[PDB]
Tab-separated table of C-alpha atoms in Angstrom:
chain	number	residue	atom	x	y	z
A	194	UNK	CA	63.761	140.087	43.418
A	195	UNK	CA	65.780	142.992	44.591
A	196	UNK	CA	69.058	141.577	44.044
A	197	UNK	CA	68.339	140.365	40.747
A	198	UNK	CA	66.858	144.042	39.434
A	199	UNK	CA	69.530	146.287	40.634
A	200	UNK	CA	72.633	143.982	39.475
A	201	UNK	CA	70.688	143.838	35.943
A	202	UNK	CA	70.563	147.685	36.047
A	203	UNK	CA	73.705	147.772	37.096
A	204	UNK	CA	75.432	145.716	34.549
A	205	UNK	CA	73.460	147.368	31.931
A	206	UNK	CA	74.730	150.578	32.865
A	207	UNK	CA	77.883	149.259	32.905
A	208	UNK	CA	77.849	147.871	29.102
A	209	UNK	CA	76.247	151.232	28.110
A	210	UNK	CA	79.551	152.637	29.247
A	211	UNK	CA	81.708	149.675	27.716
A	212	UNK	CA	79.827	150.707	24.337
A	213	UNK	CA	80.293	154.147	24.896
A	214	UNK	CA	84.452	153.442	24.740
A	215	UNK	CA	83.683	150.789	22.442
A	216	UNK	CA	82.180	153.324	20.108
A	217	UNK	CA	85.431	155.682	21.114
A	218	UNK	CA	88.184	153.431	19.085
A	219	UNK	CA	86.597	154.622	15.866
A	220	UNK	CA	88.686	156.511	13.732
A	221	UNK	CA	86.651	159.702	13.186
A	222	UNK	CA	86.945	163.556	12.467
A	223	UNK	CA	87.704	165.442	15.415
A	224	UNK	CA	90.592	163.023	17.059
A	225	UNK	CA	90.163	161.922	20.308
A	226	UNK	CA	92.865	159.402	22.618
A	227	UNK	CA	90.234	156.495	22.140
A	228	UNK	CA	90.943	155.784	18.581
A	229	UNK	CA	94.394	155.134	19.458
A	230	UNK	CA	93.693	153.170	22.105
A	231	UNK	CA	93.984	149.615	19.815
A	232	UNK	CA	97.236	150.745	19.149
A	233	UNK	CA	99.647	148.432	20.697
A	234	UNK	CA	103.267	148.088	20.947
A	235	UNK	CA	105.830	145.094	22.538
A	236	UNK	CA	106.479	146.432	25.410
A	237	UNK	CA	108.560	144.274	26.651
A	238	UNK	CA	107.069	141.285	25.352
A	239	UNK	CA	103.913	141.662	25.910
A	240	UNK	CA	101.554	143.291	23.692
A	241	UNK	CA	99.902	146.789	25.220
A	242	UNK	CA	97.830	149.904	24.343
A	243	UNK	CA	99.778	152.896	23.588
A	244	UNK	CA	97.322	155.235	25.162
A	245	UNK	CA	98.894	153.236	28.430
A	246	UNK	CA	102.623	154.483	26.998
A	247	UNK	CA	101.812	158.007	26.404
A	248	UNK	CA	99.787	160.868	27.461
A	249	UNK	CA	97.665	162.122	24.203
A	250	UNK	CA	96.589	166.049	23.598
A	251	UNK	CA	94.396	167.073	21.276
A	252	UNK	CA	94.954	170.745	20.282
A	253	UNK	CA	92.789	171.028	17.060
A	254	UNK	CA	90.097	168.732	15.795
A	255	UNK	CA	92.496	166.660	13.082
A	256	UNK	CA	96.101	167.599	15.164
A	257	UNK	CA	97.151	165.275	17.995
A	258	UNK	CA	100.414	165.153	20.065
A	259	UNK	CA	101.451	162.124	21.664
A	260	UNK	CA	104.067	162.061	24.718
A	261	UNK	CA	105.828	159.029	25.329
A	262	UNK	CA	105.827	158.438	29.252
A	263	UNK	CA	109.712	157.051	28.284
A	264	UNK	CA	111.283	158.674	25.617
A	265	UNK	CA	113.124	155.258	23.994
A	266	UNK	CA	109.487	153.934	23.206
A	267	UNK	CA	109.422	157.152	20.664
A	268	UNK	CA	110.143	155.130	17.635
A	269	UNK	CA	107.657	151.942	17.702
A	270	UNK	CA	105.225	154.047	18.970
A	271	UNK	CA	105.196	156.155	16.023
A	272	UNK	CA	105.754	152.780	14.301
A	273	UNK	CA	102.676	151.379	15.570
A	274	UNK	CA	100.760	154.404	14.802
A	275	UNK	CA	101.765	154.816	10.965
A	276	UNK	CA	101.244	150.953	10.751
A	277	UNK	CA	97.781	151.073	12.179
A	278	UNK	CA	94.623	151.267	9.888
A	279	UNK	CA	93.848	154.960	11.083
A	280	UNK	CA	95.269	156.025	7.479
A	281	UNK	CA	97.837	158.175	8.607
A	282	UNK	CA	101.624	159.138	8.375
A	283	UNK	CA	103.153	160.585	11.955
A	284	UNK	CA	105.989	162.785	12.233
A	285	UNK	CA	108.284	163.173	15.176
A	286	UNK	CA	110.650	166.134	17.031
A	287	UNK	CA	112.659	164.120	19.016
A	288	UNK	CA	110.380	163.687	21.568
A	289	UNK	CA	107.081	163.884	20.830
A	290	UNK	CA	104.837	162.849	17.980
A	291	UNK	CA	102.842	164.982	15.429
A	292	UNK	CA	99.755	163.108	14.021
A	293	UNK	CA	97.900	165.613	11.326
A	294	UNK	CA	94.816	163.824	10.455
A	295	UNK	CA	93.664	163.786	7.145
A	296	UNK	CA	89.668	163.891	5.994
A	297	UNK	CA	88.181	160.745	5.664
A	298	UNK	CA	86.834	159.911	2.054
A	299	UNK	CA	82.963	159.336	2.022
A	300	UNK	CA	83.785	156.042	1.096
A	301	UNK	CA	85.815	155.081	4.721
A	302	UNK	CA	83.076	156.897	6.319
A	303	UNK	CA	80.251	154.554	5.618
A	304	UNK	CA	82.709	151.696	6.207
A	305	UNK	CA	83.304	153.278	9.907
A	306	UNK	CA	79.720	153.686	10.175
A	307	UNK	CA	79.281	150.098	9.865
A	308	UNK	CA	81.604	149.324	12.321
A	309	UNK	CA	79.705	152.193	15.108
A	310	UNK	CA	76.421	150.289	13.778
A	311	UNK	CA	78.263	146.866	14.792
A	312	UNK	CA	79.212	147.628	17.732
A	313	UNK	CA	75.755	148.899	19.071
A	314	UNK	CA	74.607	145.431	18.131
A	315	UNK	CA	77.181	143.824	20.294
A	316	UNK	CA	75.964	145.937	23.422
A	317	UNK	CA	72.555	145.969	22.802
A	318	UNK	CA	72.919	142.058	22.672
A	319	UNK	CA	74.562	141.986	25.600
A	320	UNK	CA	72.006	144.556	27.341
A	321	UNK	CA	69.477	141.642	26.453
A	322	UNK	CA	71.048	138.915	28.013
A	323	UNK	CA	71.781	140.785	31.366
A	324	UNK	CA	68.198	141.271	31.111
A	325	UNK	CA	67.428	137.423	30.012
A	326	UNK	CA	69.106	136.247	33.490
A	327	UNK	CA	67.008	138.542	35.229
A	328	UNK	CA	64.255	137.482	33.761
A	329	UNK	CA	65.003	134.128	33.947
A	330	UNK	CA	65.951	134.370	37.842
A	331	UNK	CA	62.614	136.428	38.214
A	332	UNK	CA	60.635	133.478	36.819
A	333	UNK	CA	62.414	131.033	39.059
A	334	UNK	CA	61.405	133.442	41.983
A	335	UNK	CA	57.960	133.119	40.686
A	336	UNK	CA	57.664	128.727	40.529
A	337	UNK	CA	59.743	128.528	43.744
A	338	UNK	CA	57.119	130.906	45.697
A	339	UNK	CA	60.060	133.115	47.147
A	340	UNK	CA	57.386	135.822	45.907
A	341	UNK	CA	53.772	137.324	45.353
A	342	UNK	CA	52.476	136.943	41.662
A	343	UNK	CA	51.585	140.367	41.795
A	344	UNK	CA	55.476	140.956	43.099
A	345	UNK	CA	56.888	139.645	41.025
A	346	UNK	CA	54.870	140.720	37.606
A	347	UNK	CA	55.447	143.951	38.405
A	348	UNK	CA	59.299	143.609	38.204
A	349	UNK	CA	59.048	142.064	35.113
A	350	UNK	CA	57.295	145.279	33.736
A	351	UNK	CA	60.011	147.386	35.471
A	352	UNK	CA	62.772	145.213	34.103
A	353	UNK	CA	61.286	145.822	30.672
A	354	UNK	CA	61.165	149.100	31.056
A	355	UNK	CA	65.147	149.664	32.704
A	356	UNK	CA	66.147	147.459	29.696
A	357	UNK	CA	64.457	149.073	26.764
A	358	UNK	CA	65.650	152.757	28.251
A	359	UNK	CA	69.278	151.441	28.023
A	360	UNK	CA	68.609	149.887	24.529
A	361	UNK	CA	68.021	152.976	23.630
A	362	UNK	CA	70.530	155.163	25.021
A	363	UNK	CA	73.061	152.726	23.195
A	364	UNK	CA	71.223	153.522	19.818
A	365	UNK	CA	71.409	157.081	20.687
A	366	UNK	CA	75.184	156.490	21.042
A	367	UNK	CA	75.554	155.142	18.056
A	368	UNK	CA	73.508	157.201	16.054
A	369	UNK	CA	75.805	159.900	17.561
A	370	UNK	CA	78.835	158.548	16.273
A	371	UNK	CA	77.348	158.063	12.730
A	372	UNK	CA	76.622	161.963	13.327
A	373	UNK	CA	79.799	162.707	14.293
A	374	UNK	CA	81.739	160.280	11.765
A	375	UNK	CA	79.349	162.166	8.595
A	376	UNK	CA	79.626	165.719	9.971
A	377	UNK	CA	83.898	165.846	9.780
C-alpha cells in the first residue's frame, strides 16, 4: 500500500512540475528563457533547444539578450528565433542578440490562452492516470488479501484526496498563466 501511495504522490508532483515548464514555453508578456526553449537549431545534425546553446537574460519585461555559449552559432540562432512563431524580429551586435518583444494583440492572447488551457488538460490527465494505477494496484491489494479492508479504504480516501490537491494546483497554474498572458 505504501509503495503504491508515495510513488503516485510522487509522480504527481513530478507532472505538476512538468506542467509548470510546460506552461513556461508560452509566448507571453513579461519574457522569460522558457518560451524560447522550443527553439531549436542543427547543431550539428541533430536538432536541439537553444536555451541549451545560450545563456538568456532578461533585463526588462519585453527586452531579452541571448549569449551564444559559441559565438559561430550567432547567426541560426537568431535565425531560429526570427523564424519561430513568437512573432518577433531579433537584432544582433556581433555577439549577442537583442529580442524587443512586441505586445501581443488581444486576438493572439486568447489563442495562447487556449494553448495554457490545453496544456493543463494534458497534466491533469496524466495526474489521473498516475492515480488510476494506484488505484488499480490498491484494489488488487484489496482481492489478493495483502491488506485490511479498513487499510486499505482508507488509502483510497487519501489517494483521492493527494490527487484532487494536485488537480488543483495545476488549474491554479494555469489559471495563472491566463492571468499573466491577459495582464501584459
Amino acid at each position: 500500500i505504501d509503495e503504491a501511495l508515495f510513488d503516485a504522490e510522487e509522480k504527481m508532483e513530478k507532472a505538476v512540475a512538468v506542467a509548470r515548464d510546460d506552461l513556461s514555453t508560452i509566448r507571453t508578456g513579461r519574457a522569460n528563457p522558457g518560451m524560447f526553449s522550443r527553439i531549436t537549431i542543427d547543431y550539428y545534425g541533430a536538432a536541439t533547444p537553444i536555451t541549451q546553446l545560450a545563456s538568456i537574460n532578461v533585463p526588462e519585461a519585453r527586452l531579452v539578450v541571448i549569449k551564444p555559449y559559441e559565438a559561430n552559432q550567432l547567426r541560426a540562432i537568431e535565425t531560429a528565433i526570427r523564424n519561430s512563431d513568437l512573432g518577433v524580429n531579433p537584432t544582433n551586435d556581433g555577439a549577442l542578440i537583442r529580442v524587443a518583444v512586441p505586445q501581443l494583440t488581444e486576438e493572439r492572447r486568447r489563442e495562447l490562452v487556449k494553448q495554457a488551457k490545453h496544456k493543463g488538460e494534458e497534466a491533469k490527465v496524466s495526474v489521473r492516470n498516475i492515480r488510476r494505477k494506484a488505484m488499480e494496484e490498491l484494489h488488487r491489494i484489496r482481492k489478493e488479501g495483502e491488506a485490511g479492508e479498513d487499510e486499505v479504504g482508507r488509502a483510497e480516501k487519501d489517494l483521492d484526496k493527494t490527487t484532487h490537491q494536485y488537480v488543483t494546483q495545476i488549474d491554479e497554474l494555469v489559471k495563472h498563466k491566463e492571468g499573466e498572458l491577459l495582464e501584459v
